[PDB]
Structure formats: structure tokens, C-alpha cells
Amino acid sequence: MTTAHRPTFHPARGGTARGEGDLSKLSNQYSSKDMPSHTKMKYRQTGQETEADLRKKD
Amino acid sequence: DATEKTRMALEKIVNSKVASAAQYIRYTPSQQNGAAGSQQRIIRMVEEQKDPMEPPKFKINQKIPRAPPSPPAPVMHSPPRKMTAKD
Amino acid sequence: LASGQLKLSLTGHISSVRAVKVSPRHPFLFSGGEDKQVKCWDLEYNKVIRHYHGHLSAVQALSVHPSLDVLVTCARDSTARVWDMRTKAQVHCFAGHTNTVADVVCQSVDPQVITASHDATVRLWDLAAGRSMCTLTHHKK
Amino acid sequence: KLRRVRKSPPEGWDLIEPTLEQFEAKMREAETEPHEGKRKTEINWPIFRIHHQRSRYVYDMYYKKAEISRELYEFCLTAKFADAALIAKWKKQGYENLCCVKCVNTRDSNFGTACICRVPKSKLDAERVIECVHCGCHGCSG
Amino acid sequence: EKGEKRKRVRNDDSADIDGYTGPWSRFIDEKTVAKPTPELQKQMDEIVKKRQEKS
Amino acid sequence: EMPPEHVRKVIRDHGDMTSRKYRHDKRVYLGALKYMPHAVLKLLENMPMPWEQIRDVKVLYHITGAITFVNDIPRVIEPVYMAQWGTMWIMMRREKRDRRHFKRMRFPPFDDEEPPLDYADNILDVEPLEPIQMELDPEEDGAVAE
Amino acid sequence: QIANNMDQAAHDRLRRMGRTQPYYKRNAPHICSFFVKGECKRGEECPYRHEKPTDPDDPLSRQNIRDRYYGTNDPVAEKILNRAAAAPTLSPPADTTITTLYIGNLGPSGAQQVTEKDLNDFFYQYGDIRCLRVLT
Amino acid sequence: QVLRQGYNMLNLLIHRKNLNYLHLDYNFNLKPVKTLTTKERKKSRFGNAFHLCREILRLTKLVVDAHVQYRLNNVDAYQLADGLQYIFAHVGQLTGMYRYKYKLMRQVRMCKDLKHLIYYRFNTGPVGKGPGCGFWAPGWRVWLFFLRGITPLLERWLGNLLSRQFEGRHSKGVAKTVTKQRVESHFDLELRAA
Ligand SMILES: O=P(O)(O)O[C@H]1[C@H](OP(=O)(O)O)[C@@H](OP(=O)(O)O)[C@H](OP(=O)(O)O)[C@@H](OP(=O)(O)O)[C@H]1OP(=O)(O)O
Ligand SMILES: [Mg+2]
Ligand SMILES: [Zn+2]
Numbered sequence: 001m002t003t004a005h006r007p008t009f010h011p012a013r014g015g016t017a018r019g020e021g022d023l024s025k026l027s028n029q030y031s032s033k034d035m036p037s038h039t040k041m042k043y044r045q046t047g048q049e050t051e052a053d054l055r056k057k058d
Numbered sequence: 059d060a061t062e063k064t065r066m067a068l069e070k071i072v073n074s075k076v077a078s079a080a081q082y083i084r085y086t087p088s089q090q091n092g093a094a095g096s097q098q099r100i101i102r103m104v105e106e107q108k109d110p111m112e113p114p115k116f117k118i119n120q121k122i123p124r125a126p127p128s129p130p131a132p133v134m135h136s137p138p139r140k141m142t143a144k145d
Numbered sequence: 146l147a148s149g150q151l152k153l154s155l156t157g158h159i160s161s162v163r164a165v166k167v168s169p170r171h172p173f174l175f176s177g178g179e180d181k182q183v184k185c186w187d188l189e190y191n192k193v194i195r196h197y198h199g200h201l202s203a204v205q206a207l208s209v210h211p212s213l214d215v216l217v218t219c220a221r222d223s224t225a226r227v228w229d230m231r232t233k234a235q236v237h238c239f240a241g242h243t244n245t246v247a248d249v250v251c252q253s254v255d256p257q258v259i260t261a262s263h264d265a266t267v268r269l270w271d272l273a274a275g276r277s278m279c280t281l282t283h284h285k286k
Numbered sequence: 287k288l289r290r291v292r293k294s295p296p297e298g299w300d301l302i303e304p305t306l307e308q309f310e311a312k313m314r315e316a317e318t319e320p321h322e323g324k325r326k327t328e329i330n331w332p333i334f335r336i337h338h339q340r341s342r343y344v345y346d347m348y349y350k351k352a353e354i355s356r357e358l359y360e361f362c363l364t365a366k367f368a369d370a371a372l373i374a375k376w377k378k379q380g381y382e383n384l385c386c387v388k389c390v391n392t393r394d395s396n397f398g399t400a401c402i403c404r405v406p407k408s409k410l411d412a413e414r415v416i417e418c419v420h421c422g423c424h425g426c427s428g
Numbered sequence: 429e430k431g432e433k434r435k436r437v438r439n440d441d442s443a444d445i446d447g448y449t450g451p452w453s454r455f456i457d458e459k460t461v462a463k464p465t466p467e468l469q470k471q472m473d474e475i476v477k478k479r480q481e482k483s
Numbered sequence: 484e485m486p487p488e489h490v491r492k493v494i495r496d497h498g499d500m501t502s503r504k505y506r507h508d509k510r511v512y513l514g515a516l517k518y519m520p521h522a523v524l525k526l527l528e529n530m531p532m533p534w535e536q537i538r539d540v541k542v543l544y545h546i547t548g549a550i551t552f553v554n555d556i557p558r559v560i561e562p563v564y565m566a567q568w569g570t571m572w573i574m575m576r577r578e579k580r581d582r583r584h585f586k587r588m589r590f591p592p593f594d595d596e597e598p599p600l601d602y603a604d605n606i607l608d609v610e611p612l613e614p615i616q617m618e619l620d621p622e623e624d625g626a627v628a629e
Numbered sequence: 630q631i632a633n634n635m636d637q638a639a640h641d642r643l644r645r646m647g648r649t650q651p652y653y654k655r656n657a658p659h660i661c662s663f664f665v666k667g668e669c670k671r672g673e674e675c676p677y678r679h680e681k682p683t684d685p686d687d688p689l690s691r692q693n694i695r696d697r698y699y700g701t702n703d704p705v706a707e708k709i710l711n712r713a714a715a716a717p718t719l720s721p722p723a724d725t726t727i728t729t730l731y732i733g734n735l736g737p738s739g740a741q742q743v744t745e746k747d748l749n750d751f752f753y754q755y756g757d758i759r760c761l762r763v764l765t
Numbered sequence: 766q767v768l769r770q771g772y773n774m775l776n777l778l779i780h781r782k783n784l785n786y787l788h789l790d791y792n793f794n795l796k797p798v799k800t801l802t803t804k805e806r807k808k809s810r811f812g813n814a815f816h817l818c819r820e821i822l823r824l825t826k827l828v829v830d831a832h833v834q835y836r837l838n839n840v841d842a843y844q845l846a847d848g849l850q851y852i853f854a855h856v857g858q859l860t861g862m863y864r865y866k867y868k869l870m871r872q873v874r875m876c877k878d879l880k881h882l883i884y885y886r887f888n889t890g891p892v893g894k895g896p897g898c899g900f901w902a903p904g905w906r907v908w909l910f911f912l913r914g915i916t917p918l919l920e921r922w923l924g925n926l927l928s929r930q931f932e933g934r935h936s937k938g939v940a941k942t943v944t945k946q947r948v949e950s951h952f953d954l955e956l957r958a959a
């Protein structure tokens with residue numbers, strides 16, 4: 001009987017790759033996509049309407 | 059108070075974590091045999107200088123099964139709705 | 146919202162979208178895919194600028210923390226993961242569910258993260274320590 | 287080393303040159319003698335010992351003996367016949383018999399201390415013989 | 429306590445190329461090398477053979 | 484700073500890396516490779532301009548010989564440097580005119596199986612033949628010629 | 630397992646064998662193997678010891694780390710255990726009906742002698758004396 | 766020293782892998798000393814980080830050997846300068862680098878442009894064609910600005926090569942993206958799971 005072509009009747013779970021909570025294990029390889037991006041945050045301006053400004057208005 | 063508490067712990071962690079990616083100790087030893095006459099020791103810690111050329115010391119792709127789940131929480135259902143013959 | 150008019154279509158995802166959140170503190174929109182990708186959209190350019198990589202199968206909820214710069218996403222693979230939306234770093238993996246997760250909601254006071262799962266449990270999480278301390282088992286489904 | 291300084295040696299040079307040429311002969315041997323039958327430290331120690339002498343010779347000639355003027359002494363420092371960074375120590379009160387530089391350095395040690403050979407070796411211990419790892423110096427304070 | 433140093437064979441005329449020292453010192457009385465005599469050799473001599481007989 | 488002979492001795496003794504006494508250093512020699520693009524960059528940046536026959540550079544080097552970095556940054560007073568290269572232009576054009584036959588050197592200059600030279604033995608005390616320098620006229624150039 | 634362990638009688642056995650003073654000689658230094666060959670050109674300067682090594686017949690020399698840590702075939706442990714089993718102790722007489730204990734080394738008569746109370750107020754912790762006699 | 770050091774480092778990486786059937790000659794050509802089987806080929810093929818380092822060291826040996834040939838006194842002053850000029854423009858050829866870096870071809874073209882720039886003005890007058898234009902410095906600079914950008918790139922790439930070699934390969938669980946081929950089969954998994 002063919003059985004090696006199994007579907008995901010029993011899917012694997014997260015939390016067990018490199019460094020996931022293991023982080024001292026994290027390993028010194030890191031190169032390609034992770035290294036360079038957007039290190040300074042853009043905070044939204046005052047007056048986004050949402051919690052306190054909406055109550056402030058009718 | 060909650061928001062300030064949350065960041066301040068992870069912050070100290072993240073700085074060591076990207077690094078992963080005088081000072082003394084006074085030691086009071088319960089083993090009373092001791093240094094001569096001294097109920098405590100005081101001791102100097104220095105850090106081994108990391109050689110900036112030396113490549114990673116140890117193999118760390120060692121892999122072991124997931125740690126057992128925390129012991130089961132009681133299952134707490136309402137009593138089974140029996141629906142036996144027709145459903 | 147008022148006119149119902151359409152005014153963008155953003156074509157970055159690879160196979161299906163099913164999470165959207167608009168940040169209440171940054172001009173960013175976050176989205177999660179059955180294509181295993183969480184994307185950050187910058188609402189000053191309409192382009193994508195961050196990817197959060199680690200989910201092993203379809204994302205199906207995400208939440209954006211009301212006061213930290215922290216993002217949490219649920220997926221199949223039966224975990225939620227916590228992300229730092231500045232660096233893209235992943236700095237919790239809330240494994241502890243045993244079946245696919247799909248809801249997460251965040252709040253500033255403890256429990257900062259609440260997750261709901263196809264294992265028929267809700268869990269309440271200590272976002273600082275990364276541990277869980279409730280299992281609200283009362284659901285049958 | 288004379289090509290490195292372009293001007294010709296000043297007047298005294300005939301006196302020192304026979305000696306300075308012998309220190310070069312020694313140093314070429316110490317560079318090249320076989321690295322086997324000697325500790326991993328010991329093979330470096332001849333280099334520092336000859337370097338110490340050569341600087342001490344130029345230093346003694348001007349300061350103790352006055353047999354070379356200033357202009358030839360300063361010429362020797364510029365030629366790099368003399369370790370003049372080290373000679374700056376020998377001028378100091380309390381360092382006048384120093385071995386190399388590395389033993390004073392402190393920052394290269396584990397505990398932030400100068401080498402052992404400094405340790406007024408009279409004071410150190412009743413009988414302890416020493417050969418410090420940097421240059422085999424037995425004790426260079428007295 | 430509430431209220432000699434061993435002597436050294438110094439040649440510190442810096443012109444004496446092949447002979448000098450001036451902080452390099454063997455003492456007027458010193459052992460540079462130390463060895464078992466023959467009786468102490470013969471005790472140790474069997475020890476290395478007993479280690480090789482294991483092979 | 485410490486005697487130039489020390490790095491020669493270290494580099495000479497280690498150099499084969501069959502030395503098994505030195506085998507403990509082999510681990511550090513490999514890791515140094517990460518920096519080697521940086522060591523090449525600093526070496527070539529420093530390279531002696533054609534009117535210099537020998538240039539002495541300051542190097543930063545690892546106590547095991549594992550890698551040598553050249554610690555200089557070569558700075559120039561740019562009107563002097565433009566003037567110096569301007570005299571090379573004059574001289575190099577003059578030689579190409581006068582030579583009739585100019586033998587361009589062969590590349591690679593050493594055969595693939597020829598091991599690199601013993602520099603302390605071979606190069607160190609053969610005196611260099613003179614560089615490209617223009618004969619500055621001490622009457623017109625005396626502000627500069629010395 | 631060790632943190633919870635209860636058997637005070639077992640603890641008190643260990644305390645007796647344990648020894649009560651630190652042994653620095655085992656802490657302090659390595660042996661000069663060039664001196665074992667007999668050729669140590671370093672000799673006064675040496676660091677390492679210039680004294681007899683342990684003989685290769687002496688199984689105490691052999692001990693690994695893992696055997697010691699896991700605690701199997703550890704030669705020094707077996708030496709300690711053999712002396713602990715050799716150490717003398719009482720086992721009661723074959724006459725089952727005997728309930729009499731001789732006591733000795735009470736010291737001399739006079740002010741150094743223990744009183745009846747000093748036996749009464751201690752040995753009644755164990756069981757009911759039927760008769761007590763003293764021979765000062 | 767940097768060439769000795771560079772030679773030993775790559776040669777030690779070969780031995781660390783235990784690829785004793787490869788030979789690295791003193792000009793940094795990597796030759797296989799025998800006919801590889803299949804498995805020796807799979808094991809030995811290791812190019813992009815290693816060869817770009819190796820070819821930058823090849824270039825450095827060409828330059829330093831030119832200076833060595835001068836210092837020996839068998840290439841005078843002018844033949845060195847023409848040698849150094851030649852090495853920097855014609856480095857496109859002597860660079861095996863072009864393969865791996867292939868954006869590097871931008872620098873090859875830019876030195877070719879400078880060569881025409883210099884040679885035309887240098888030859889102008891009674892000065893013949895052919896060798897002798899020792900005016901190396903414009904071409905030399907182009908490679909230093911190349912090396913500026915490559916230095917962090919190779920330091921990162923070599924750090925990843927070295928670290929996995931010492932640490933081991935950790936790829937046994939990282940998340941895999943779902944690009945073109947995987948997209949069609951991945952839709953059914955997420956469908957069947959749903
Ligand atoms: O590189 P060089 O040894 O200085 O030779 C160049 C080069 O000749 P090759 O590349 O064929 O070796 C030029 O070619 P390009 O590299 O610029 O394509 C060539 O130009 P041609 O292609 O027309 O032959 C030119 O010779 P010419 O003066 O005839 O243009 C000649 O320059 P020099 O003669 O001044 O050295
Ligand atoms: Mg395919
Ligand atoms: Zn000293």
C-alpha cells in the first residue's frame with residue numbers, strides 16, 4: 001500500500017526551530033533578509049481621531 | 059505601570075540578545091569548613107577576553123524532542139448532550 | 146467608511162489574505178496570509194516594508210499591541226508568535242496550544258495576550274515572561 | 287635601516303656602528319634558529335632580549351657614557367636602532383632596569399596587572415624563581 | 429608581628445654583546461635541571477613499560 | 484609598539500600549519516578568514532606610490548600571526564599629490580617615448596607552483612633600484628625640491 | 630531525589646565516613662612529565678611537581694570522569710566503602726532473651742562520674758528500663 | 766604576510782572540510798588533483814563565498830608580486846608602474862571574480878573607460894602605442910571602492926560559512942517561503958486543513 005504520499009492528518013507544531021525561546025542557541029548565521037531595515041519607528045501623529053479625540057467631538 | 063514594566067525587562071534582554079546574534083562578589087558559604095576563620099569570602103570577577111577572530115566554539119544544531127506540555131488543565135465541559143439514534 | 150468607495154488595491158500577498166490590523170499608534174497596516182507571510186504596509190508610501198518570517202503554516206489572526214511596539218500573530222502550527230515591529234525580531238513563541246490557533250487579542254494590562262484555538266481552549270498569556278497561566282477549557286469545540 | 291632615514295649618520299657613527307652591526311647579526315640568527323626543542327614561549331624570548339640590549343646600548347652610550355652626542359642619539363632613535371618607546375621607560379624613576387614593554391602594559395593581562403617580573407622581586411617570596419611568559423625576564427625591579 | 433635575598437650573576441655592561449644580562453638572572457648557586465639519580469630512575473623506568481604492556 | 488622581528492618569527496614558525504604544536508592556533512586561523520576582505524582592503528589602500536621605493540606601514544596583527552591588518556589611512560596634501568602625479572605623467576611619457584622597446588612584465592609574475600618568497604632572506608637586504616622621480620631643478624623648484 | 634531524601638540513619642552513616650578537613654594536595658598541582666622521563670631543563674623554574682607519579686598498577690590512577698560522576702566502578706569510592714563496611718559495630722547476641730547492656734568508659738569515681746539521672750533522663754528516650762545498676 | 770595568511774586560511778578550510786583531493790596553488794587557482802567521483806563533486810562544490818575571497822586574494826597576489834619583482838631588481842620602476850596599470854584595467858580577465866560577483870562587471874567597464882581616458886591623453890604627442898603608460902592610480906581607486914562595498918558583504922558571507930562549519934547547519938526547521946512551484950501544491954494543503 002502507498003502511504004508515503006501522506007496528507008497532513010497530523011500537522012507539526014511551532015516553537016522548536018533555531019532560537020525560538022532557545023535564543024542563547026540562536027546561532028551566528030543571519031545574513032540575507034534579516035540584517036537591514038527601518039530601524040527608526042514612525043509614530044502616528046497626534047490627532048488620529050480614535051479614542052480620546054472622537055469622544056472630544058460629538 | 060504595566061506597559062513600562064513589560065518593556066524594561068525585554069529591553070535588557072534584547073541588548074544581550076543582539077550580542078548573542080571593578081566588580082566583586084561576597085560569597086557566604088554554607089559549607090562551614092571555610093577559608094581560614096572567615097564565614098564569607100570576597101572575590102574578584104573578571105571576564106575572559108573574547109578573541110575577536112575566534113570562530114564559534116561549539117556545535118549547537120543538536121536537536122531533541124519538544125519539552126512535555128505543562129500538566130493538563132481539567133476539562134470543565136457541561137454534561138454531554140446525548141443525541142444518540144437519529145442525529 | 147462613509148461613502149463605501151474603494152480607493153486602493155494592494156497586491157503583495159501570494160495566495161490568500163486573512164488578517165488585517167491597522168495600528169492605533171503608527172501609520173502602518175499589518176496583514177497575515179495563508180501564504181505563510183506577515184507583512185507590514187506603510188501608510189505613507191503604500192509599499193511593504195517589513196516581513197516577519199517564522200510562521201510554519203497559514204497565519205489566521207494577528208493583533209497589534211495597544212501601547213507597546215509589539216505585534217502578535219496566530220497560525221496553523223498551533224502557536225502564536227510575538228514580534229517587535231521595529232526590528233522584525235521574534236521575541237516569544239507561545240507554543241502551548243495543541244491545534245491550530247486563530248484568534249488573538251491584546252490589551253495593555255495583564256493578561257496582555259489572549260489566544261483561542263481549535264483545541265477548544267482559550268489561553269491567557271503573561272507577555273512579559275512568555276508563559277501561559279490560564280487554560281479556559283470550558284468550550285467543547 | 288639607513289635607507290629609511292635618507293640623511294647620512296652624524297659624526298659619532300663610527301664608534302657605535304661596529305657594535306650595532308653585531309646586534310643585527312645576533313637578531314638575524316634569533317629570527318631564524320629552529321623552533322624545536324624550545325617551549326612555544328621560549329622561541330620569542332631571544333628577539334626581545336636582543337632588542338632590549340640594543341636599545342640599552344644606545345641609551346647607555348648617550349646617558350651613562352656620553353660617548354655619542356644628541357644628534358647621533360636622536361638619529362639612532364629615528365633609524366630605529368633603538369626602541370625609544372622603551373627608552374622612555376628607563377628614564378623613569380622605578381623602571382630603569384625594565385625588560386620589554388609588554389610586561390609593564392597591564393591591560394593585556396587577565397586581572398589588569400603588570401607582569402610578575404616587576405614585583406620588586408626581593409619582596410615577592412623567599413625562594414620563588416620566575417621566568418615570565420612574555421620575555422623570560424627573571425625580575426626587573428631588584 | 430603586630431609592630432638574605434638570593435644573589436645574582438649580573439653582566440649588565442650593555443656593550444658586551446654576547447654575554448649581557450640585566451634582568452635575566454641565574455643565581456650564583458642554582459639548579460637549571462633536576463633529575464632522578466639511578467634508583468629513582470629505575471622505579472620510574474618500570475612505570476612507563478607497565479603503561480605500554482596494556483597495549 | 485614592539486619589535487618588527489616578532490611577527491616575522493611568529494609567521495615563519497606557524498607558516499606551514501602542519502606544525503602540530505601550533506595546531507591549537509589552527510582554530511583561530513580559520514576564524515580570521517572572516518576579516519580577510521578587510522585586510523586586503525587596508526593593504527592595497529596603503530600601496531606605495533611610484534616615486535617611493537620602500538614604504539613603511541604600521542600594522543595591527545594577531546599574536547599568533549593569524550591575520551595582519553595595515554593600520555594606516557594614507558592621507559595626502561592634495562596639491563602635493565596632484566603635483567607628484569603630475570611629475571609622473573611627465574616622466575612616464577618621456578620614458579615611453581625614449582625606450583623604443585618597453586618590455587611589459589609577465590602576468591602572473593610567479594609560476595603557480597613557485598612558493599612565495601622568503602622575504603627576510605630574499606627581499607629584505609637586496610637594495611631597491613631607484614624609483615620614477617623627476618629631476619627637480621633646484622633653482623626653479625627650490626621651494627619644493629628638498 | 631537527593632533534596633527530598635529522608636533517611637537520617639543513612640545521612641549519619643555518610644557523615645562519619647565523609648572526613649572533616651579539606652584536602653588541598655588534591656586541589657593544587659599537576660606532575661612534571663619531562664621530569665618523569667628525567668630531562669626537565671626547566672627544573673627550578675618548572676611549575677609542575679618533581680615527585681613520584683602514581684604507579685600504573687594502582688587502580689586509583691585509572692578513574693575516568695563519567696565513571697566518577699555517574700558513580701560506577703569509581704576506584705576511590707570502592708576504597709571508602711570497603712573501609713566503611715570494615716568499620717566495627719555492634720550486632721546483638723544470639724541469646725534472644727538477653728536485654729542487658731554493659732556500659733563502660735564512664736570515667737573515674739568522684740565528680741567526673743555521671744549521675745543516675747544522666748542515664749535515666751537519656752536512655753528512657755529509647756525504651757522502658759526494667760533495672761539499672763552502676764559500678765563506680 | 767597577508768597572502769601567506771590568506772593562503773593558509775583557505776587551505777585550512779579545505780583541510781577542515783577534508784577535501785584532500787583538491788589543491789590550491791600558490792596563485793590561488795583551485796585545481797582538483799584527481800578525477801572526482803560523484804560524491805566528491807557534491808562535497809567539493811562550494812563556490813560563492815570561498816571563490817570571491819580566493820579571487821580577491823588572487824588579485825592581491827598579482828599586485829604584490831609586481832612589487833616583489835621590482836624589489837628583487839628584475840623589473841625596474843617604469844615596468845612596475847605599467848604592471849600596476851595593466852593589472853587594474855585587465856583585472857577583468859585575470860579576475861575569475863567576474864563569475865561570482867557578476868555585478869562586478871560594472872567596475873571592469875569603468876576601468877576600461879578610464880584606460881581609454883588616460884591612454885588617449887597619454888599617447889597624444891610623439892608617444893607611441895603599446896606598453897608604458899604607468900599612470901595606474903585612477904584604475905587602482907576603482908577597485909578600492911569596490912572593496913569598500915564587498916568588505917561587509919564577504920565578512921557576512923564568510924561569517925555564515927565559518928559559523929555553520931563550526932556550529933553545524935541549523936536549517937532543520939526554519940520556515941520556508943512559498944514561491945512559484947510550491948504555490949500550487951500549497952493551496953491544497955491550506956484548503957484541506959481549512
Ligand atoms: O590594453 P593595452 O595592452 O594597453 O592595449 C590597448 C588595447 O588593446 P587590447 O585590449 O587588444 O589588448 C585596446 O583595446 P581595448 O581594451 O580598448 O578594446 C586597443 O585598441 P584596439 O581595440 O583598436 O586594438 C589599443 O590599441 P589602439 O591604440 O590601436 O586603439 C591598445 O591601446 P595602446 O596601443 O595605447 O596600448
Ligand atoms: Mg523545483
Ligand atoms: Zn621584566
Ligand SMILES: [Zn+2]
Nearest residue numbers: 385386389421
Ligand atoms: Zn618583559
Ligand SMILES: [Zn+2]
Nearest residue numbers: 389401403418
Ligand atoms: Zn614579565
Ligand SMILES: [Zn+2]
Nearest residue numbers: 661664669675
Ligand atoms: Zn620539571
